[PDB]
Amino acid sequence: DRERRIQERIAEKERLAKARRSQVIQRDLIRPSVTQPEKWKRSLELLKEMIALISSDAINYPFGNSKVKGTANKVPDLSNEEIERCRLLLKKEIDDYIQFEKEFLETYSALHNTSSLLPGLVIYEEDDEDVEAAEKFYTNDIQRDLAKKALECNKLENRVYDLVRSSYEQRNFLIKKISHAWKALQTE
């Protein structure tokens, strides 16, 4: 009697938990990184300084295990009915032909931005730097290259051991068999 409903009440808590659902970490794909506080002071002109708090809220989840810089948690929390109402507010006012024009516009303009440049110069199309952007990004690329070379050479040793065990025999047997037997069959 008790647990047939008590465990159901626990499932009720998990059913109340589905209503409360943030984003960004809901699908947990990447994140606004760690060096948060500097970007907010660096912000020019308006909503760039407001995204500060949500980025500071992103350190509450274990993503901060990647790194921590400044922290400065200012979580304002939210509500389920709050989220739903403004989802209505957004999608009531925002008809497919403009979206076709949008997709054409964004794709081209991207292709214009996405030039044949190894480092990202779209911001540098307005800024003035090419050599140092060529330096830091692809010295990090070299460092990851070295790390990958190391973790592969750790696995080369067992391959070359198995291979002096197998392909060395294969090549020796191959040469000794093929050359001698084949040049003897013709003579016979």
Binding site: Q23, V24, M50, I54, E82
Partner: protein, 131 residues
């Protein structure tokens, strides 16, 4: 003849009974070997779902002048450079779409906060007008 897979002209176009779309037999067979399901409809797909078809072949550019012909390496270098550039732009697209998603989240949050402000201020103004 506009192949939806890369844009290159397909020398062996195929048709599908459930949803006819331009692919190549070898690639779809290999994908079904990897995962025997329809990629678009998320339904089981078998090896007998494709019907044989005939194709008229194409021409080749056949580069002449036979001078030590080492240009293959340069074309290879260009191919890896292109794929590396495309990977970088994958990274940029992911970063920009996530930044836009976050910006949208706080924009809608600010809309809620400012609408609370609006309703409270309008109630205050109308009540003082009644007073």
């Amino acid at each position: 003849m506009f192949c939806s897979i890369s844009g290159e002209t397909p020398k062996e176009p195929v048709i599908s009974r459930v949803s006819g779309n331009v692919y190549e037999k070898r690639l779809i067979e290999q994908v079904i070997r990897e995962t025997s399901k329809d990629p678009v409809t998320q339904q089981e797909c078998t090896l007998e779902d494709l019907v044989p078809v005939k194709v008229p072949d194409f021409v080749r550019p056949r580069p002449p002048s036979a001078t030590s012909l080492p240009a293959l390496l340069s074309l290879f270098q260009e191919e890896w450079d292109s794929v590396a550039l495309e990977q970088f732009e994958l990274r940029r697209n992911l970063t920009e779409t996530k930044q836009e998603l976050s910006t949208a989240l706080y924009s809608l949050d600010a809309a809620l906060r400012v609408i609370s402000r609006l309703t409270k201020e309008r109630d205050e103004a109308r009540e003082a007008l009644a007073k």
